[PDB]
From a paper:
Dimerization allows activation or repression of gene expression by binding to the promoter region of its target genes. In turn, Crp regulates expression of the type III secretion system and the Pla protease essential for pneumonic plague.
We considered that the sequence differences might affect cAMP binding or dimerization and thus cause changes in DNA binding. Crp was crystallized as a dimer, and each monomer had cAMP bound to the binding site. V127 in Crp from E. coli is pointed away from dimerization interface, and it is not involved in the cAMP binding, so isoleucine at this position in Y. pestis does not have any impact that contributes to binding of cAMP or to dimer formation. As confirmation of our findings, an electrophoretic mobility shift assay (EMSA) performed in the presence of cAMP indicated that Crp requires cAMP to bind a DNA fragment that corresponds to the pla promoter.
Residue numbers in the entry:
A (entry chain B): 9 to 208
B (entry chain A): 6 to 208
The structure:
Amino acid sequence: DPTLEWFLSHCHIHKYPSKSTLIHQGEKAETLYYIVKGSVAVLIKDEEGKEMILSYLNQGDFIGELGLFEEGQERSAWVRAKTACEVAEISYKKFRQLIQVNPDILMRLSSQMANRLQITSEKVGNLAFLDVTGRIAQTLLNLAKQPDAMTHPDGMQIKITRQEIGQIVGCSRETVGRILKMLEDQNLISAHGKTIVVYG
Amino acid sequence: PQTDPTLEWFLSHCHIHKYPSKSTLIHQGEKAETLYYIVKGSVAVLIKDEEGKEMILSYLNQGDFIGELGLFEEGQERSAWVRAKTACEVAEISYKKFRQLIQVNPDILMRLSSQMANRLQITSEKVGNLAFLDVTGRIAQTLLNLAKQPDAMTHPDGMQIKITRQEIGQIVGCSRETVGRILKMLEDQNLISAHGKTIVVYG
Ligand SMILES: Nc1ncnc2c1ncn2[C@@H]1O[C@@H]2COP(=O)(O)O[C@H]2[C@H]1O
Ligand SMILES: Nc1ncnc2c1ncn2[C@@H]1O[C@@H]2COP(=O)(O)O[C@H]2[C@H]1O
Ligand SMILES: [Cl-]
Ligand SMILES: [Cl-]
Ligand SMILES: [Cl-]
């Protein structure tokens, strides 16, 4: 589409190796990014440096957009490359100029911010009233009904690790372990290495 | 609370409607064709968990856009209910008309997008608190957050807020009973005072 091509023609595409930290929470924001190729993780941390993934972002996603609208904004989160990444970069100053020329580019960015807000809002509603057990159970049941869940003699099989469960619900890997054992004993799931079976 | 030429130009293209306290501005799931802007008053943005329990996702106040999430893609449905907390005065404009205003002066889209960005930050922090903080910490953080809403009073011991235990539970994501037990504890810890329907957050 011509809007994205026009936008990219004003950007400088950079290549970063896997595990690069592209954005550090707390730093001064003066640049907008757009993923041309690759995937990243958006993360927040607690005092002990524990973690919760807010989102994965991929090809076609803007990153670092939240500091664009007000002066002196700081990065709201960490963004770390999951794979090697090809990322277009443009100063906020230049981007603001592009918006006056053709605001459709700001409509595209804002469309992504709107979706992100709806997704993050839904996660608040889904997790707020539950304790860690409730959150883990809901998480597994939700994954069991997604298209990539596979058929199993015992029910629906999902691919997920104790670590990434903990990253979704914001708890330790050990707590996940204990809760998965409990869910097995209640005859709701079966856990086998890096896969879980939710009983139907 | 602070308008500017861009906003008054925008408002000159809108119709301002009044909404009594408790009335619904927006119903979740309805087709979105209208953008709102609060001239006066406050609203609550509500969503429900998988058991049908209602949460207060955010309050919005004078100067806030509402109903913007449906503007960017066709056939979008409202993501939440929005109901008046006080009597409100709200400017309305069709998405069709607003898209034309954007072409006339994109600064109005910058104003709207700025709020969307702020909301994402705020909501992201809330999702992090759900995990990083215990229930006590979540209630304590909500009390602070509420001590900074415009409707917050001054007090010789700190900031005095007006909110029901029910409402604290809907913001935090816990039961009214839990809130009661935690406010008592915080009171005994000399961090707050609960004078009936009022709470004083010490500073
Ligand atoms: N809830 C979220 N969902 C998706 N992306 C996010 C979320 N919160 C922050 N980000 C992204 O992470 C970036 C961190 O830097 P910025 O705050 O400039 O811009 C932020 C967004 O691009
Ligand atoms: N997390 C949030 N913070 C503040 N306001 C929100 C949030 N989620 C939804 N809203 C508002 O509630 C509105 C419901 O209708 P829309 O989805 O059109 O637009 C939505 C936003 O204006
Ligand atoms: Cl509606
Ligand atoms: Cl807890
Ligand atoms: Cl009360």
